[PDB]
Design a protein around this ligand. Structure first.
Ligand SMILES: *C(=O)[C@H](NC(=O)/C(=N/OC(C)(C)C(=O)O)c1csc(N)n1)[C@@H]1NC(C(=O)O)=C(C[n+]2ccccc2)CS1
Ligand SMILES: *C(=O)[C@H](NC(=O)/C(=N\OC(C)(C)C(=O)O)c1csc(N)n1)[C@@H]1NC(C(=O)O)=C(C[n+]2ccccc2)CS1
Lengths: 248, 248
């Protein structure tokens, strides 16, 4: 890439106030104007968890495993790890409620060869898909940094991923999470569970904010060993952006 | 063709409770299952006012007058009728604040001949562009019915207009007005003025609502001779959609 990134450790106070280890990366306009609380962690690769839905959906559409933007994913009737997943879902619905089994099925149908090819085209992390075709991003070896998430998202925002513009637009449509006349947020959450206290889990929030004629890309991750701390994955980024002029 | 529509006069309740003459057309899934409070008014053509920004944006992109979805429409610093228009705007921003001068400039560049052609391809209303390029949707002869709006919007939803899929997708993202995990609204307003008591203006609200795996298309218009009545263009459709269990 061509990222210019500045460490601003004053951003650490939002983390230390909550007794949390993580990083926030925030870029205005492009990856040529970025800042983070922690340069080292910004470039450190973690398990993507549900953030992998963004590339998975694009790859689904590119390969034709997902037939089109209007496809419904029907619940077969058999139980699932969350109740919110026990229903028929659109592409957007599945992404928004973060329905893992829908996406495990897409990936099985895609196959390792095509998966491997596309993660190379997207420069997605360490591009290591071993661990099982249906769980490399969930408990396998695939890892990605906050910096790389931002680069990836920027490419998607600009329709520069190696995929049709149509497919990128379909997925961007699925990622909208807040809409107002001159304020638009596209975003995706992730959470791997609580791991242990020796080896904590990871929580993510990644996306971008449009406000007037500006765009801001962001990626946040944190170590999480306690499910009660999970709200911080939005409140910390929100507070940093408030203090910068974005959400405030 | 192919619309099936039912008159349900119980929907007149919300209209007469506010002393308003108007029509609501609501369709579930497709134009094969529609209902309205007034069949004759459903098919009557009125000037589209700011709802014309939907086709106008598609045509802008199709002819290359709008370069892409990231184009910024710069303000020249000279007065505009609305304070909210006195700033640089994205395409989505210009649509959402209904920035008439941005779209007048788009229309001027498109020209009469190209405008005519796309209104024909879209079956948009009486397809009448007479009066001069500086007035037809405004001080002009173009008129469209609520039924024809619902047909137009269904085509757009299905990416079936005669326009690239990517241009239709661009315009759809510009139209999003509420986003939640399993509830998505795309909508546009219009208001032509107060006219006279004898010749009222028109106000519109058109769009569609995605809920779970269903879609509902809607178009509302009403006669308006008093600006204080304007909010009814949202509250009356809202009430009817609530009573049908949609607004959830
Ligand atoms: C589009 O429907 C409206 N455009 C018009 O240009 C007309 N406006 O008439 C009013 C605003 C009443 C006036 O005093 O000029 C018009 C005249 S002849 C014709 N065909 N159209 C825009 N609509 C609109 C609204 O729907 O409420 C406006 C106010 N908003 C601005 C920003 C956000 C929401 C609403 C401004 S013009
Ligand atoms: C995708 O990142 C999320 N993760 C999972 O499905 C995984 N674990 O989910 C648990 C531990 C919460 C569970 O028991 O269901 C998982 C394990 S290892 C791995 N890579 N993923 C979905 N995301 C998500 C979120 O990102 O916030 C959810 C929110 N949530 C969690 C718990 C309680 C209420 C809401 C749902 S799971």
């Amino acid at each position: 890439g061509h990222m210019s990134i500045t460490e601003n450790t004053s951003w650490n106070k939002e983390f230390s106030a909550e007794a949390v280890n993580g990083v926030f990366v925030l870029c205005k306009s492009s990856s040529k104007s970025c800042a983070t609380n922690d340069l080292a962690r910004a470039s450190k690769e973690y398990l993507p968890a549900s953030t992998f839905k963004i590339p998975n959906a694009i790859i689904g559409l590119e390969t034709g495993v997902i037939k089109n933007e209007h496809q419904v994913f029907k619940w077969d009737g058999k139980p699932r790890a969350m109740k919110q997943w026990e229903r028929d879902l659109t592409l957007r619905g599945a992404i928004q409620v973060s329905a893992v089994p829908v996406f495990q099925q897409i990936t099985r149908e895609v196959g390792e060869v095509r998966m491997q090819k596309y993660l190379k085209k997207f420069s997605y992390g360490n591009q290591n898909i071993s661990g099982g075709i249906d769980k490399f991003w969930l408990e396998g070896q695939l890892r990605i940094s906050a910096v790389n998430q931002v680069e990836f998202l920027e490419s998607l925002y600009l329709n520069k991923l190696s995929a049709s513009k149509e497919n990128q637009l379909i997925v961007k449509e699925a990622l909208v999470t807040e809409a107002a006349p001159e304020y638009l947020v596209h975003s995706k959450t992730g959470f791997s569970g609580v791991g242990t206290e020796s080896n904590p889990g990871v929580a993510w929030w990644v996306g971008w904010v449009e406000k007037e004629t500006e765009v801001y890309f962001f990626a946040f991750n944190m170590d999480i060993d306690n499910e009660s701390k999970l709200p911080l994955r939005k409140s910390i980024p929100t507070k940093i952006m408030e203090s910068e002029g974005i959400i405030g």
